[PDB]
Ligand binder design. Sequence first.
Ligand SMILES: C[n+]1cn([C@@H]2O[C@H](COP(=O)(O)OP(=O)(O)OP(=O)(O)O)[C@@H](O)[C@H]2O)c2nc(N)[nH]c(=O)c21
Ligand SMILES: [Zn+2]
Lengths: 727, 748, 482
Amino acid sequence: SGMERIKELMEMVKNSRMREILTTTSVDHMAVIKKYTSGRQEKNPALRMKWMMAMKYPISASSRIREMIPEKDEDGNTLWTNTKDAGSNRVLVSPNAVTWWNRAGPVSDVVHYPRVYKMYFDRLERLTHGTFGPVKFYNQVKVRKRVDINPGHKDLTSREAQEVIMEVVFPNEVGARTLSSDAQLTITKEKKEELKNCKISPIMVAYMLERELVRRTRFLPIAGATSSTYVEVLHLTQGTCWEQQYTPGGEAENDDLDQTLIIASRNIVRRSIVAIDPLASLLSMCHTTSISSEPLVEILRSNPTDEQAVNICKAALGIRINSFSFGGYNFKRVKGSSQRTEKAVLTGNLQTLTMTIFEGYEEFNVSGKRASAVLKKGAQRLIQAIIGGRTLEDILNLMITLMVFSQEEKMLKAVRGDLNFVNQRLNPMYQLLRHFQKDSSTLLKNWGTEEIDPIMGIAGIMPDGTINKTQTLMGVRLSQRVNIDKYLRVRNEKGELLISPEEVSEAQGQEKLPINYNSSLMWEVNGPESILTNTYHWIIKNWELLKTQWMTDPTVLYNRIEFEPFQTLIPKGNRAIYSGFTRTLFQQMRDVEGTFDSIQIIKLLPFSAHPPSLGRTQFSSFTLNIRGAPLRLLIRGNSQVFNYNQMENVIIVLGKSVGSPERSILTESSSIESAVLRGFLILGKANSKYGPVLTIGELDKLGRGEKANVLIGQGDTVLVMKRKRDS
Amino acid sequence: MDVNPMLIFLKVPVQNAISTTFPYTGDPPYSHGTGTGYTMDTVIRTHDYSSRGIWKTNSETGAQQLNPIDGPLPEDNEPSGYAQTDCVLELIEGLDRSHPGLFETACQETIDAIQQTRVDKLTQGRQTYDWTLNRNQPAATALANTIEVFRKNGYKLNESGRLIDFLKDVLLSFENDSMEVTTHFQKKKRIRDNMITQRTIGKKRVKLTKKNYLIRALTLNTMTKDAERGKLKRRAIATPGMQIRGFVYFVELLARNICERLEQSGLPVGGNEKKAKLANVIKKMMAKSTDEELSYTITGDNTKWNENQNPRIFLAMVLRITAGQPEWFRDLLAVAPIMFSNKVARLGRGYMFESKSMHLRTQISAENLSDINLRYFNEDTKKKIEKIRHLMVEGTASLSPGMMMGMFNMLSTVLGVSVLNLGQREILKRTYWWDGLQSSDDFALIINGHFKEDIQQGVNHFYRTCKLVGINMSQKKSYINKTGTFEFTSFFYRYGFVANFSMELPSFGVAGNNESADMSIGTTVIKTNMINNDLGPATAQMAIQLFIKDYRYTYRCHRGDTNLETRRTKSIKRLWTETISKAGLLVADGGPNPYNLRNLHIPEVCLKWSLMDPDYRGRLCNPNNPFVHHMEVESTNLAVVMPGPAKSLEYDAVATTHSWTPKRNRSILNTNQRGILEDERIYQKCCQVFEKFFPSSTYRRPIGMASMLDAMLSRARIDARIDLESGRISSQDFSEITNTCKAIEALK
Amino acid sequence: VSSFKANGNIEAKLGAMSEKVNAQIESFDPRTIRELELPEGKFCTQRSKFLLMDAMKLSVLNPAHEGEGIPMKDAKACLDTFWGWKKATIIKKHEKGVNTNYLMIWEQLLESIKEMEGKFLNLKKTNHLKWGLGEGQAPEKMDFEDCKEVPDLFQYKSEPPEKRKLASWIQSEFNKASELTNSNWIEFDELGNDVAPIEHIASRRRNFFTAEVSQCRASEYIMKAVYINTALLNSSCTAMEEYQVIPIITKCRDTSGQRRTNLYGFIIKGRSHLRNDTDVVNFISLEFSLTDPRNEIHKWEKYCVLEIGDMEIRTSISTIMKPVYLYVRTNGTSKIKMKWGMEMRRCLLQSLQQVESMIEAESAVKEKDMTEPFFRNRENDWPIGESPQGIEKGTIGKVCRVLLAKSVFNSIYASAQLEGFSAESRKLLLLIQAFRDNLDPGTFDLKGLYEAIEECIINDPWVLLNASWFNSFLKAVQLSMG
RNA sequence: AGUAGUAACAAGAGGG
RNA sequence: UAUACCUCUGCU
Ligand SMILES: C[n+]1cn([C@@H]2O[C@H](COP(=O)(O)OP(=O)(O)OP(=O)(O)O)[C@@H](O)[C@H]2O)c2nc(N)[nH]c(=O)c21
Ligand SMILES: [Zn+2]
């Protein structure tokens, strides 16, 4: 009707008290006067509530309550009073009112409320259909990282959501904006369909939608999976010393799967590379590994990702790496690879298209309808295209198709006008094609011309369509089974190298979904901090065993396969010289009796597991590639990596205790320190009587037996002697 | 044997057993009576630190203004306020140099902000000093009063509906020498009874002088800070006025956008992020160093941070940061530093005297501290009077130098940050160098070099370089050691950040919003602490267990099968026996606790939904219930919490009959402000009806410059028409509605 | 400002600035540094709201829940379990008090209990009670004009607190607080059923905690605190003008699981028009005891101690009769004070957090749930005491009770002194820890910190005891190191 | 008295 | 001047 509101409005406007306000205060001011109250924010609500709950009538409720419920309940409890709430036409009420309502008030239909409160009920939904595994106990290193908080966030910006809300809950009173996308429209119609005739305060729907649509992030300490659905349950999933393995209800997300697969495959490859028979070491890990409780094999079988490690794994498991099609033609990549960068770029009419640009040298066999070509592509570059066809037209068509496919600046710069090609609006790659097919007039004027050397069979094409022997369009020329070896090199049938484990990058971010290796080659915990802590733990747990093994038969010790995961953290070329340097430093400790630094042995030992080189280069520290940034373990003394704390009697690796060594080692010292410098013994504090102090780079002009002062590290000047014998 | 819990520290490192040093399970300290003594102590000490500076009388005000900036350099370690404008400008420039196009974007954002900012955005936030009433009031009222007074005098640009048009008026209002305000007072009529005296409130117009209004608009209020942990003696906090708020908002809004893009700025980010920045700086400070270099961290506190932070320096900062931008914007932001540099401080409630022989007590207004015999007071107090009297203006006390806690933020940090950003190898080019993190008085500074003396040099250099901009490191409380262990704002880094759970203990309990909210908060407190502060499973379980016990007792909502005797237990028993599926009843209706580690993130209603009696849930969630009062989206499911100053807390809950509000304070009924309740009661009934014509008003604030009635009518037509035309209404009803719509519009 | 450019100002100004402005690092060494200076004066008195180790219960067997039944009926029921009463006589005087008024109060109360029916018990406003509950002792408020010219009108006494000296008793009280009893004091509400393994683990670990904690004497203080403070807040809010009686009750279970109601004494609440969160309710505490005050008379300054009866007790070999004392006193509290007393159970969290973190800390490195080892595989390995033999290592179960007692005492004796002391001494502890980690600690103004700490040690038994503990710790560290 | 602790409470305001 | 009542208020 809209009747009683104008009756009410008349009945108000009669009263000059308020007819004053309604006339005087504007719509901008009504917001200022709505929040006008005598009441302050309560300073101590916990106290105030404990105070008020002992009173008879502490709750305030709408006066209509006096119509809706009785004054005295069955037991003689007074439910409401006539005393009105300071600053309101509201009544003071007993808690017994709330109970009486809940046991014998009016009933309502609320059965669709879960559609309003979806955001909450999905939490329950994920939990009820979650599954737990076992609890594992270990040093749980957590990265403080910004992460998502709002699983089921249909990702759109605040006002973009606001429009969608306003549409759904406030349809007549909508503002004045366009519904940008099917992103908005589908959500609007679906949520409008879902929330159809639900008896609830619109405000609550607006609130719940506002909470439901927009992304929300937080800085959290996280070990393991960083997906929203895993962030939802950190409190249940991880502790200080424990991991409660858990998979939450419902299905994983392709982006997260594809993202994590790369990191898995990378770590598999980077591990395998170190082991003997890397192919065999890989294959077992690929068979045993499971992502988010799903087989890596059955992922890789039916997952389309193109990455070097993933491709090494696909080649090893014997599944076709990836050919494809575009613009009518079928492309098959023969050589090279490319990394994918999503970007925004401007056409010649300054229109912003959002590409997924490819960077890298690639070679393609392109074929199809009446025309074939070989393509050589660089990052936004057509290096060379050799095109053949049954008609000049069919050539030219493929030429335009490739010239598009290059993603060159030239061709974007070339686009005059806007691109509104379609009711499905095609992606920019196609927009550009279906543009230039309809008009390549400018494209060829701007593409440019080479002079070239005339060859029998080959010919050049000119921007006007002419064929020319010695001139051609930039890069264009007209002319009429995989295997993998022991060490993970990917060869083609001809014997040429496609993919190399030397070319595979480090694992970049942090896993989205959880990775579960069931492989003795890998440690129980994921990541590098794990590797360091476990590698230094195993040593301490089996110290006494390995201490004799150090004395008697070292060359066996150094080949301990438990040291392999540690090697992945060392950079490729350093391992040999590091292990040699280490081994020499140990040998010095054997050759020079008396000196014996169990902690120094424990510290450096894991670097020893590689075939050493004969170089005589000095090292104050060893680098370790952990989570991107290089960490430098100092050879002399404590570090951010390895820190022996005597107060605790504990080795501390990256902030976490790895164990207590034998109390024997606290009371253990000697003035001479072996196992620091190569052919050089340390003999205590630096004495000025051996001249001005030297550096580590200036220790190849000293006599065998000559004492000299050295700035050894961490601002310490030390007395150093060159030893006589050569280890 | 005698037990000594500290002996644990023999075996366990301090940081690992730090909880045992945090006694946060007992009532904190609370000031009783006034904080005039503290305010005067602050005002005194503040001048005492700047005593060497230049004294001058303000022409417009007549306040004894001390200026220390660019004054004589200090020749001892004591707290000094002698900052140097060139030495500031050098750092503030060095910052611009160090962050290419920071200030450009920072300003560019603040411009669009200033352009787009409504007046409404000032009704949000903390309580403000209301120059109209000479008392603190909530922002929404304190503004509304100033707008109403501005409207009653000749000032109505703000009627536009944009913050800068209000912000304008404030500067023009300084011109009007005779400012008209309406004061309220109690009178007493004589009434008959079918004859007794009857109290009643009446109004009285008063006109204030340039002198007065200018003082009142430069007045900041003072209080004692209560519930303050870690400290033996109480401190004086301050509250800003309704004028300066609008400028402070934009200065802080710039300084925020400045801070947000600085690795050394602690503000405005949360602890997890602060810790990430503190990681980043260490990781970087190691990754940049060489294997023959030392690394020393300073655990750092800055003594007398506010007392020695000058507003003229803020004028320099805010100017230099805006340099190159539009001079209107350059001016607008410069207002707050000026207005602060001419700040006067109220001296609070005053004092209370007691006669032992007569057995009587009396109150004294701080305003009376000019004309009062000193025989009543003691030495320390009467001497503080002696000292304050020379600075005392129309009830208030002049405070040109320094600052006071609670008025201004963030920018003060940028001054610190810039002194950190000075310490890059690429700027210093010495044998030593530095970096760190700072927020307000608290700082962590990593100094790197080749040798201990080389570090010492950088310590001295830093320490003096701060003194030159009026920053005073606390030699007492700050300390230094090799990089590895440090303290920062009660975070403890020991080769990595450890746990400090004790800090959060006060958060564990019944927050006292209501049955609905408290249950959602309590669980989330347990949940977030498990994640953030190493609260283990078994203890968390026990926190659930105790929370339930506290919640049940507090709200008198014990389980329906208990024999306890309260005002509810019968009516809860009725419901308990009546109910078929008991597990569905909420704890607040005497149902069982459903929570354990896995459930903590799931709201009680949501968690118990399937198990409820469909009658009972239909009553529980009945949107027609009178216990709830309909909120707005911006304030739906929100509470208030104090960690920092004071912050809002969102929580997850389903709107039930347990989502009520408790009774309001009634003490105002006895006061002369008794009308404000009626004002509120009326004001609400207008918006309540308006919302029927604009349901959209409760989700988004309706932007419009038009009479609130006219908007209601203009719609009331077209709704009444379209309900018929392309709908289901009778033209007799349409004609009746339009006849009403005209009939009321006839009435003025 | 616009046309400013940095030529080289700061360095010039630093050049100009005096060399007295320096941050000179004095390198820190715990072997060098002295003990904290404890204050001297009269010995510190007990200032709790109820008796600790010197409390005495009249108990009855009662199968009721742990907050059920009419508390006065439960009290009456307990009263009857004591046979041999007497005529009351004052044996230790309240030096500043009208010691008759206490003796009249006890009898008034004790008769008023015998002559009541129903739930509510309000005493009648007799002068001797009025005096003890501070009736009328607020001066009458006046306008300043009307009392400008009075001679002795001053501002209220605003001096710092009188210094006091560390008596032994507090360490004793703590030593008892730190012990097990033969009764379950804490009764935890129900939880959601366990599903996740970690929940089962959690409960497994929680059982041990509950075992070590629920019997601990600290927990008996927690329950007394909670009951007293809830009762007092509620009665303060509901009966503002009455003198309500509140019997000091707790409910427990024996080692048999047999349920028992205890009566420690009575509280007579004053008037309670509590407006500000600091406003005071005066009350009278009347509490049973076997302890003779006169053997430690400094401990009981504020109390008037009566002798009220006798009873028999058996030792190991012998068996003898002892007299029963009633410790009577006027005390006070505030909305904020009792609000926090209601919440004392959070101590359990403070205690158990630290332990669970210690268990988990090992569990991580051992790679295994180290709970059942820690509790069951009993090894005394955490230093928690000092005897004439030397440093005394205890077990995790002991550490629980110690930490619990600490956390409880922090709640019972909360004070700005503790607040400051705790905040500042932490820095000195961290300075020690930095040396003991060999991180070369340096300080700028140490004696400033020593004075900042020492400033907060005035008259609080708990803060004095903590200051002492810090010294014992410092010495204990110095010895092992030097 | 007692609470308390750098200043208050030990009811305040009104029917004057 | 005293004694009785009665009203409002318990963060304003
Ligand atoms: C420009 N370019 C396009 N493709 C592939 O060509 C096909 C059609 O290109 P498209 O742009 O229509 O692909 P899609 O809509 O799947 O979005 P995209 O995968 O993000 O591009 C897809 O299979 C692309 O991966 C490409 N493949 C390789 N190897 N190198 C390239 O430079 C390149
Ligand atoms: Zn209960």
